[PDB]
Design a protein around this ligand. Structure first.
Ligand SMILES: *[C@@H]1O[C@H](CO)[C@@H](O[C@@H]2O[C@H](CO)[C@@H](O[C@@H]3O[C@H](CO)[C@@H](O)[C@H](O)[C@@H]3O)[C@H](O)[C@H]2NC(C)=O)[C@H](O)[C@H]1NC(C)=O
Ligand SMILES: *[C@@H]1O[C@H](CO)[C@@H](O[C@@H]2O[C@H](CO)[C@@H](O[C@@H]3O[C@H](CO)[C@@H](O)[C@H](O)[C@@H]3O)[C@H](O)[C@H]2NC(C)=O)[C@H](O)[C@H]1NC(C)=O
Ligand SMILES: *[C@@H]1O[C@H](CO)[C@@H](O[C@@H]2O[C@H](CO)[C@@H](O[C@@H]3O[C@H](CO)[C@@H](O)[C@H](O)[C@@H]3O)[C@H](O)[C@H]2NC(C)=O)[C@H](O)[C@H]1NC(C)=O
Ligand SMILES: *[C@@H]1O[C@H](CO)[C@@H](O[C@@H]2O[C@H](CO)[C@@H](O)[C@H](O)[C@H]2NC(C)=O)[C@H](O)[C@H]1NC(C)=O
Ligand SMILES: *[C@@H]1O[C@H](CO)[C@@H](O[C@@H]2O[C@H](CO)[C@@H](O)[C@H](O)[C@H]2NC(C)=O)[C@H](O)[C@H]1NC(C)=O
Ligand SMILES: *[C@@H]1O[C@H](CO)[C@@H](O[C@@H]2O[C@H](CO)[C@@H](O)[C@H](O)[C@H]2NC(C)=O)[C@H](O)[C@H]1NC(C)=O
Ligand SMILES: *[C@@H]1O[C@H](CO)[C@@H](O[C@@H]2O[C@H](CO)[C@@H](O)[C@H](O)[C@H]2NC(C)=O)[C@H](O)[C@H]1NC(C)=O
Ligand SMILES: *[C@@H]1O[C@H](CO)[C@@H](O)[C@H](O)[C@H]1NC(C)=O
Ligand SMILES: *[C@@H]1O[C@H](CO)[C@@H](O)[C@H](O)[C@H]1NC(C)=O
Ligand SMILES: *[C@@H]1O[C@H](CO)[C@@H](O)[C@H](O)[C@H]1NC(C)=O
Lengths: 183, 176, 49, 111, 49
């Protein structure tokens, strides 16, 4: 309901969230993993105004732009991240209530049948493992051959359908010629 | 009417190669996008004239009758107007990522979206004394939290609420 | 097989059919997609272990 | 099947909040649900520590968190303010008061 | 709604193992989840009654 903002100074007992939180240095204010995902996927016509194949579609085939620009979606994602890393899950019901992160992780272990002393005695090791996993996931995403298969396929299918529809114009259909003017 | 290639459009100068035997241009859907001049042997590029669709942004006929008009991807000043075009060819012409908006202001404020337009732009019928404004979509009030190493916020009261929900289950049968 | 279902063996029937543009390719693509989806469906139901 | 005939633990499935009940109503080609939820309200912030040390040992709460109003400490529930005096029936000892970080000094009660 | 805003008790719904958290990320015409799970390791057998 309300766009939360991240705390000014970032420290959470050892966990390194700098790989998912927004980066003010970049012009678009997007997390590094979001930047990698954006660079991985390829697009031709995004619906922006530009008065080769994309410009050829003047036979009535137009692409309208989405209502939500791909700049406030990042704001929604950042709000969700801040709410879920600061106030636990309590912001899903009413007003958000502050709670320190180790206590949240203690709750989360208590919720799967593990007593809470485990984390209060293995905090450092758990933090190191979490940081290592977060570090490795970016390399796995970057060096994999093609992991974004689904989005690429859904992008390609529409382009293929539009190309077939455009190419269908130059067919005689049993007539003398495919040009409406010469006839 | 170049040698019988009857058509309509704008002719410009192109940088195509067009080896001496070649004299036509072609692409998908059998559209001649270039042509060699029969007399001066100059190559020309053919482009279709400006065209598009229009949309009408109105509140209900009950509330009022003032409307605004949106032209799809025209970039306004390029070719806004060449009867129905009595709208002053002006009156706060505004430009957006979706097209040319005629008949609405642009308030610096922010409210909730009423009539979606596109690319993060909305419109409404606020009262300044009646006009149509085109603001920027507001995602809600920004809120802060006070994370600290030792702090909890435990509620002291509660509330019981009732929320409705509506779901279709079936549709009318028919036979033909 | 579209070209054999519509026309048995006569070549002029094929010549006439080519005048209708790319209608066979769409059907072939749709049927192949259906077949691949059917093959994949019975995998995540069972191949969980 | 899930909400009318029993409580549902899925978050944001039947109503915005912790679900309590449901009542169905009919409508032309449709059904209407009346989800009854439970939303907390009013707030108050306090000071906390993950554990309590008494004598070379830790003391984690059984079910609740440690909350101090400034002088004294209490155990409380996670969704409604209800302080209680710390005794041996709310805590279970686990450790030696050297690994947990943020543990503060205090005394407990022996009945 | 179920995994980001609270733990999920459904088996093999958000990640392979006992679910802990989740983090959403945007992508062109899609969303990407980062499920964080908890998997036991190492074993030792005993006698019971
Ligand atoms: C959280 O993780 C990030 C990485 O995801 C850590 O940032 C990294 O910090 C190291 C140490 O400074 C950087 O290595 C050094 O970078 C400098 C350039 O500034 C280079 O000249 C050195 O040779 C060395 O490689 C590393 O580049 C940097 N990562 C990025 C992407 O900039 C951060 O320190 C971690 N923070 C916590 C609290 O865990
Ligand atoms: C928790 O919240 C509930 C409701 O938000 C509080 O109940 C409300 O308490 C106030 C003050 O005690 C009541 O106001 C009084 O109403 C009577 C008429 O019934 C009026 O004559 C008085 O002058 C006064 O305005 C209010 O009615 C009552 N709400 C309901 C629905 O009964 C409750 O007090 C809160 N708990 C705590 C500990 O504050
Ligand atoms: C934090 O909570 C504790 C526990 O309730 C508060 O201590 C209690 O404070 C009350 C009022 O100050 C005391 O009651 C009064 O005690 C005096 C004797 O000092 C007596 O003369 C009065 O007739 C009345 O009974 C109560 O004894 C005291 N109990 C304890 C265990 O400390 C404390 O005030 C709270 N502090 C804050 C900042 O909220
Ligand atoms: C929460 O704990 C952190 C970790 O010790 C504190 O961060 C240090 O705070 C001191 C003074 O408060 C600074 O001098 C240090 O530079 C901080 N550490 C780092 C790495 O910057 C933080 O202050 C604590 N916050 C509260 C409210 O107690
Ligand atoms: C509960 O939160 C409020 C607001 O965050 C606190 O009020 C201020 O908090 C800042 C942060 O340390 C202090 O510097 C101010 O002195 C506080 N002002 C007042 C009037 O208290 C409030 O202190 C918090 N409650 C407790 C018990 O710490
Ligand atoms: C909690 O209390 C214990 C004992 O009451 C404190 O332990 C003392 O610590 C100081 C400095 O670290 C030593 O000089 C003493 O010898 C210790 N005494 C004993 C009996 O161990 C401990 O420091 C206290 N901790 C906190 C956070 O208050
Ligand atoms: C744990 O399992 C292993 C393997 O099943 C056991 O090792 C062997 O178990 C068989 C089955 O009874 C015995 O006949 C062998 O003598 C065992 N070999 C060894 C080297 O132990 C192992 O015994 C099991 N643990 C316990 C405590 O029984
Ligand atoms: C038109 O608006 C008026 C006042 O806003 C209201 O009383 C009237 O019922 C509306 N007309 C219709 C058909 O709803
Ligand atoms: C519209 O045309 C002008 C002049 O060519 C140009 O400066 C402006 O950027 C154009 N607008 C868009 C949205 O392309
Ligand atoms: C209104 O918004 C425009 C947009 O750039 C800005 O230049 C101008 O300073 C703003 N004026 C006020 C009063 O906010």
């Amino acid at each position: 309901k309300q766009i939360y903002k991240t705390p000014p100074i970032k420290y959470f007992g050892g966990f390194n969230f700098s790989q998912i939180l927004p980066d003010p240095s970049k012009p678009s204010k997007r997390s590094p993993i979001e930047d990698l995902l954006f660079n991985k996927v390829t697009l031709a016509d995004a619906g922006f105004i530009k008065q080769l194949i994309c410009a050829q579609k003047f036979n009535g085939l137009t692409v309208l732009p989405p209502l939500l620009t791909d700049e406030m979606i990042a704001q929604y994602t950042s709000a969700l991240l801040a709410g879920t890393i600061t106030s636990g899950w309590t912001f899903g019901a009413g007003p958000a209530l502050q709670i320190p992160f180790p206590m949240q992780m203690a709750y989360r272990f208590n919720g799967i049948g593990v007593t809470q002393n485990v984390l209060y005695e293995n905090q450092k090791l758990i933090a190191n493992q979490f940081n290592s996993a977060i570090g490795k996931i970016q390399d796995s995403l970057s060096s994999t051959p093609s992991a974004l298969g689904k989005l690429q396929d859904v992008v390609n299918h529409n382009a293929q359908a539009l190309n077939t529809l455009v190419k269908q114009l130059s067919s005689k259909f049993g007539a003398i010629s495919s040009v409406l003017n010469d006839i | 009417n170049f040698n019988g290639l009857t058509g309509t459009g704008v002719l410009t100068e192109s940088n195509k190669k067009f080896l001496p035997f070649q004299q036509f241009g072609r692409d998908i859907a059998d559209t001649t996008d270039a042509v060699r001049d029969p007399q001066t042997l100059e190559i020309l590029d053919i482009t279709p004239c400006s065209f598009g669709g229009v949309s009408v942004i109105t509140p209900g006929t009950n509330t009022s009758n003032q409307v605004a008009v949106l032209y799809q991807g025209v970039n306004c000043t390029e070719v806004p107007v060449a009867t129905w075009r009595v709208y002053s060819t002006g009156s706060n012409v505004f430009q957006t990522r979706a097209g040319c908006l005629i008949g609405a202001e642009y308030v610096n404020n922010s409210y909730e979206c009423d009539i979606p337009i596109g690319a993060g732009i909305c419109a409404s019928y606020q009262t300044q004394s009646q006009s149509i404004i085109a603001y920027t979509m507001s995602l809600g009030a920004e809120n802060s939290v006070a994370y600290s190493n030792n702090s909890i916020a435990i509620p002291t009261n509660f509330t019981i609420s009732v929320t409705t929900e509506i779901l279709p289950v079936s549709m009318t049968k028919t036979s033909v | 097989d579209c070209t054999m279902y519509i026309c048995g063996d006569s070549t002029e029937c094929s010549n006439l059919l080519l005048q209708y543009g790319s209608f066979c390719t769409q059907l072939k693509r749709a049927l192949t997609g259906i077949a691949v989806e059917q093959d994949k469906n019975t995998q995540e139901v069972f191949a969980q272990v | 099947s899930e909400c009318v005939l029993g409580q549902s633990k899925r978050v944001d499935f039947c109503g915005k909040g912790y679900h309590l009940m449901s009542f169905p109503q009919s409508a032309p080609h449709g059904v209407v649900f009346l989800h009854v939820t439970y939303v907390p309200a009013q707030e108050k912030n306090f000071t906390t520590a993950p554990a309590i040390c008494h004598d070379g040992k830790a003391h984690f709460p059984r079910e609740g968190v440690f909350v101090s109003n400034g002088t004294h400490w209490f155990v409380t529930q996670r969704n409604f303010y209800e302080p209680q005096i710390i005794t041996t029936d709310n805590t279970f000892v686990s450790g030696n008061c050297d690994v947990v970080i943020g543990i503060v000094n205090n005394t407990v009660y022996d009945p």
